[PDB]
Amino acid sequence: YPKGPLLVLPEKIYLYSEPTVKELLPFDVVINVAEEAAVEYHHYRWEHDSQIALDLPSLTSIIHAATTKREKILIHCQCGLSRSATLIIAYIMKYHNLSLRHSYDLLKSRADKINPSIGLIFQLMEWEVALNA
């Protein structure tokens, strides 16, 4: 397990899990994707994994808006690293026009412990088709 929020991408995107009030301090945008619970803050509570697909344009749009503002963005769940990884991968796929394989590989290489479900991987396949159409 970690060592504080993890810088996973050069554009200052951070991955983590259930931070403290002290650990949320350096961030300008926070995305919380955990199931239950200064400045820009977003909270999605998907009970089911199948629900992510509808929120991908908005969520990846939010992340990209953060990088355009050159801001530190934190994306976290608990414990749990499936939905948040999926989200980061969906962002890379769209805004860096990279394949699912490459996007996953990039994130994997930096955050070894990630494992989105097969459900979420199929979701990302669906996302790719929607990007190429």
UniProtKB/Swiss-Prot annotation:
Signal peptide: none
GO BP terms: cell integrity MAPK cascade; negative regulation of MAPK cascade; signal transduction
GO CC terms, sorted: cytoplasm; nucleus
Recorded GO MF terms: MAP kinase tyrosine phosphatase activity; MAP kinase tyrosine/serine/threonine phosphatase activity; protein tyrosine/threonine phosphatase activity
Binding-site positions, 4-O-phospho-L-tyrosine: 48
Active site per database record: 77
Domain Tyrosine-protein phosphatase per the UniProt entry, residue ranges: 4-133
Any coiled-coil regions, as ranges: none
Domain of life: Eukaryota
Keywords: Disulfide bond, Hydrolase, Protein phosphatase
EC numbers for this chain: 3.1.3.48
Catalyzed reactions: O-phospho-L-tyrosyl-[protein] + H2O = L-tyrosyl-[protein] + phosphate
Enzyme class, spelled out: hydrolase
Function, in words: Mediates dephosphorylation of MAPK substrates such as SLT2, acquiring enhanced catalytic activity under oxidative conditions.
Family to which the UniProt record says this protein belongs: Belongs to the protein-tyrosine phosphatase family. Non-receptor class dual specificity subfamily.
Designated name of the protein: Dual-specificity protein phosphatase SDP1
Species of the source: Saccharomyces cerevisiae (strain ATCC 204508 / S288c) (Baker's yeast)
Boundaries of the shown chain within the full protein: 56 to 196 of 209
